[PDB]
Amino acid sequence: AKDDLDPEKNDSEPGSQRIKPVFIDDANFRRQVSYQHAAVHIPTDIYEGS
Amino acid sequence: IRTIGNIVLVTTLLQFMFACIGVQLFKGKFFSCNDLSKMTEEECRGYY
C-alpha cells in the first residue's frame, strides 16, 4: 500500500516484488478494493527489505 | 629552492610517517549515515 500503482514505474526493490491489483469499487467500503489479497502497510521511517 | 635539502628531507619524512600513522588509526572509519542512527551501510537504506 502507499506505492504508485502505475504500471510503468517498476521500482523493484531487492528482496521484494510487488503486485498490481485490479480494484473493483465497493459498498460497505466506500473505496476501491481488491478481494484477492491483503495489502501491507509499512510505516515510513521503517525500511522494507530489512 | 636549492639551499633547502636536509631540512625538507626531514620534513617530508615527517609528513609521510604521520600519513601512515593516520592510515593505521583512521582507515575505513570516516563513513557515516544521514541520520546518525544507522551505524552500518546495510542500515542506511530507505528514508528518514
Coordinates of C-alpha atoms in Angstrom, one line a residue:
Chain A
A1 CA 0.0 0.0 0.0
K2 CA 1.1 3.6 -0.4
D3 CA 3.1 2.9 -3.6
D4 CA 2.4 4.2 -7.1
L5 CA 0.2 1.6 -8.9
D6 CA 1.2 3.0 -12.3
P7 CA 2.4 0.1 -14.4
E8 CA 5.3 1.9 -16.0
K9 CA 7.0 2.6 -12.7
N10 CA 8.8 -0.7 -11.9
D11 CA 11.0 0.2 -8.9
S12 CA 11.6 -3.5 -7.9
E13 CA 13.5 -3.2 -4.6
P14 CA 15.7 -6.2 -3.7
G15 CA 14.1 -9.0 -1.9
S16 CA 10.6 -7.8 -2.8
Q17 CA 8.2 -8.0 -5.8
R18 CA 5.0 -6.0 -5.9
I19 CA 1.5 -6.7 -7.2
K20 CA -0.6 -4.6 -9.4
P21 CA -4.2 -5.4 -8.3
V22 CA -7.4 -4.7 -10.1
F23 CA -9.5 -2.7 -7.6
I24 CA -13.2 -3.0 -8.0
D25 CA -15.3 -0.3 -6.4
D26 CA -17.4 -1.4 -3.5
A27 CA -20.1 -0.7 -1.0
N28 CA -19.5 -1.4 2.8
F29 CA -16.2 0.1 1.9
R30 CA -16.5 3.5 0.4
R31 CA -13.3 2.9 -1.6
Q32 CA -12.0 0.8 -4.4
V33 CA -10.9 -2.6 -3.1
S34 CA -9.4 -6.0 -4.1
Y35 CA -10.6 -9.3 -2.6
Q36 CA -7.8 -11.4 -3.9
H37 CA -5.1 -10.5 -1.4
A38 CA -4.2 -8.4 1.6
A39 CA -2.3 -5.1 1.4
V40 CA 0.6 -4.4 3.5
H41 CA 1.3 -1.1 5.4
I42 CA 4.9 -0.4 6.2
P43 CA 5.5 2.7 8.3
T44 CA 7.5 5.4 6.6
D45 CA 10.7 5.6 8.7
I46 CA 10.8 1.8 8.6
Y47 CA 12.7 0.4 5.7
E48 CA 11.2 -2.5 3.9
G49 CA 13.7 -5.0 2.7
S50 CA 15.3 -5.2 6.1
Chain B
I1 CA 64.8 26.4 -3.7
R2 CA 68.3 24.9 -3.7
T3 CA 69.5 25.5 -0.2
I4 CA 66.8 23.5 1.5
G5 CA 67.8 19.8 1.4
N6 CA 68.4 18.2 4.8
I7 CA 65.6 20.1 6.5
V8 CA 63.0 19.5 3.7
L9 CA 64.1 15.8 3.8
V10 CA 63.4 15.6 7.5
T11 CA 60.1 17.4 6.9
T12 CA 58.8 15.2 4.1
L13 CA 59.8 12.2 6.0
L14 CA 57.7 13.5 8.9
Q15 CA 54.7 14.2 6.6
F16 CA 54.9 10.6 5.2
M17 CA 55.3 9.0 8.6
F18 CA 52.3 10.8 10.1
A19 CA 50.3 9.9 7.0
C20 CA 51.0 6.3 7.7
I21 CA 50.1 6.6 11.4
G22 CA 46.9 8.2 10.3
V23 CA 46.1 5.4 7.9
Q24 CA 46.7 3.0 10.7
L25 CA 44.4 4.9 13.0
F26 CA 41.5 6.1 10.8
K27 CA 41.5 3.6 7.9
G28 CA 37.9 3.0 6.9
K29 CA 36.5 5.0 9.8
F30 CA 35.4 8.2 8.1
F31 CA 32.0 6.9 7.0
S32 CA 28.6 7.9 8.4
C33 CA 24.8 8.0 7.8
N34 CA 22.4 10.9 7.0
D35 CA 20.6 10.4 10.3
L36 CA 23.1 9.4 12.9
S37 CA 21.0 6.5 14.0
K38 CA 22.3 3.9 11.5
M39 CA 25.8 2.6 12.1
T40 CA 26.1 0.3 9.1
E41 CA 25.8 0.7 5.3
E42 CA 23.1 -2.0 5.4
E43 CA 21.2 0.2 8.0
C44 CA 21.3 3.4 6.0
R45 CA 18.7 2.5 3.4
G46 CA 15.2 3.9 2.9
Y47 CA 14.0 7.3 4.2
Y48 CA 14.1 9.2 7.4

